[PDB]
């Protein structure tokens, strides 16, 4: 058997940051070469592990997290960064052991009229804990007066839409991000490299 990395990387549809998608890779052999020898990736940052050595290690589980963010926000995905995406949408643990891979998807996720279907969270009472997902659509209370399920003064919708257009600059252009977390539990290892 073989791990379904291609399905995560080459997936026809990607998820929004607030509803980032999690894929569990287990009980398979993983050839990381296709990722680390590829040149289509604009961002490739591995924390706690070297990409070249990865084929030799074995892990208990692998988690692939998929989402789409603007280019300037990609820095936030890396651990220890503040930002709307990092604080309200997707947070990486300070003790992160894994790889962050990102590539330009302007040819894929942009339209002439503009793609506003990719969303992010603009407002939240508390900052997200590592690997926490908020799918809530509840109206944000900025004041004492309850919204009662209606957007109003001092009462705002928490989510906002990316505007993705082909001419927009590279930071402003959509980027697809996959985060591979290599989890080592006190249990039999089910994901291994070629060796």
């Amino acid at each position: 058997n073989l791990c379904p990395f291609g399905e995560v990387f080459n997936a026809t549809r990607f998820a929004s940051v607030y509803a980032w998608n999690r894929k569990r890779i287990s009980n398979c052999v993983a050839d990381y070469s296709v990722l680390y020898n590829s040149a289509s990736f604009s961002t490739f940052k591995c924390y706690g592990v070297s990409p070249t050595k990865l084929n030799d290690l074995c892990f208990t589980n692998v988690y692939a997290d998929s989402f789409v963010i603007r280019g300037d926000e990609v820095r936030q995905i890396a651990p220890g960064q503040t930002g709307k995406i990092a604080d309200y949408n997707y947070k990486l643990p300070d003790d992160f052991t894994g790889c962050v891979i990102a590539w330009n998807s302007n040819n894929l996720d942009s339209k002439v009229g503009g793609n506003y279907n990719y969303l992010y969270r603009l407002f939240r009472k508390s900052n997200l804990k590592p690997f926490e997902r908020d799918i809530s659509t509840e109206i944000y209370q900025a004041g004492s007066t309850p919204c009662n399920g209606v957007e109003g003064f001092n009462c705002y919708f928490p989510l906002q839409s990316y505007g993705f257009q082909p001419t927009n600059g590279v930071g402003y252009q959509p980027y697809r991000v996959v985060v591979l977390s290599f989890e080592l539990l006190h249990a039999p290892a089910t994901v291994c490299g070629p060796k």
Epitope: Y36, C46, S50, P51, T52, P79, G80, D94
Partner: antibody, heavy 128, light 109 residues
């Protein structure tokens, strides 16, 4: 969110010995490498020392030699610098700062980001 | 990498782009980090990893690194932009963090 507060310092006599502390809030201490930086009056920035938790990796500046020791308590989220045998050149504002996690590129080369969070600083004065 | 060279001073018009150059051998391998220090204030990181900019720093601030020589570019300069600017690199050989001498931005007129 993240604030680093530096205590200690003050007046030290020539040849005197001074410990410093850096308390940290908002981030888990051990994964991040923590360093000490000093700026002399009317002078440029100088790096005193760095600590790394993984192997207790310790690096010191060439000018600090056998007189300075860097200590970290990860449970307390605190950083310590013991300064012995102090001279006039060691008179500076000392900053405790957190450093971004080193990462390996796709080729496998290790790249080190630099000092995302600094502190207000504390002044050590070396007068008799 | 054990030595980083920076211009002593650079003067810029109020609306024009400013470039500060940090030079050392094989600086791109490990990373150039730039700091802005205003008088009476602690250093602030303006760009890291030769190109990445911390949150809350204006988009005008950008950095590049071209082999030995690295440049920090302020697209539109302002009175507030004036500060001492320092560059930083890491030595695996000596295990030392190396800082630049500093560059003083002075906005004319």
């Amino acid at each position: 969110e993240v604030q680093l507060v530096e205590s200690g310092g003050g007046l030290v006599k020539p040849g005197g010995s001074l410990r410093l502390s850096c308390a940290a809030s908002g981030f888990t201490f051990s994964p991040y490498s923590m360093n000490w930086v000093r700026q002399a009056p009317g002078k440029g920035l100088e790096w005193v020392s760095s600590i790394r938790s993984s192997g207790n990796y310790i690096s010191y500046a060439d000018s600090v030699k056998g007189r300075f020791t860097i200590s970290r308590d990860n449970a307390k989220n605190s950083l310590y610098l013991q300064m012995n045998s102090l001279r006039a050149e060691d008179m500076a504002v000392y900053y405790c700062a957190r450093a971004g996690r080193d990462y390996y590129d796709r080729s496998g080369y290790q790249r080190f980001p630099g000092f995302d969070y600094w502190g207000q600083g504390t002044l050590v004065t070396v007068s008799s | 990498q054990s030595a980083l060279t920076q211009p002593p001073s650079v003067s810029v018009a109020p609306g024009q782009t400013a470039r500060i150059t940090c030079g050392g051998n094989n600086i791109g391998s490990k990373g150039v980090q730039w700091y802005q220090q205003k008088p009476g204030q602690a250093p602030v990181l303006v760009v890291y990893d030769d190109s990445d900019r911390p949150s809350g720093i204006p988009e005008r601030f950008s950095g590049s690194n071209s082999g030995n020589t690295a440049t920090l570019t302020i697209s539109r300069v302002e009175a507030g932009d004036e500060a001492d600017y320092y560059c930083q690199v890491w030595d695996s050989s000596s295990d030392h963090w190396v800082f630049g001498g500093g560059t003083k931005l002075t906005v004319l007129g």
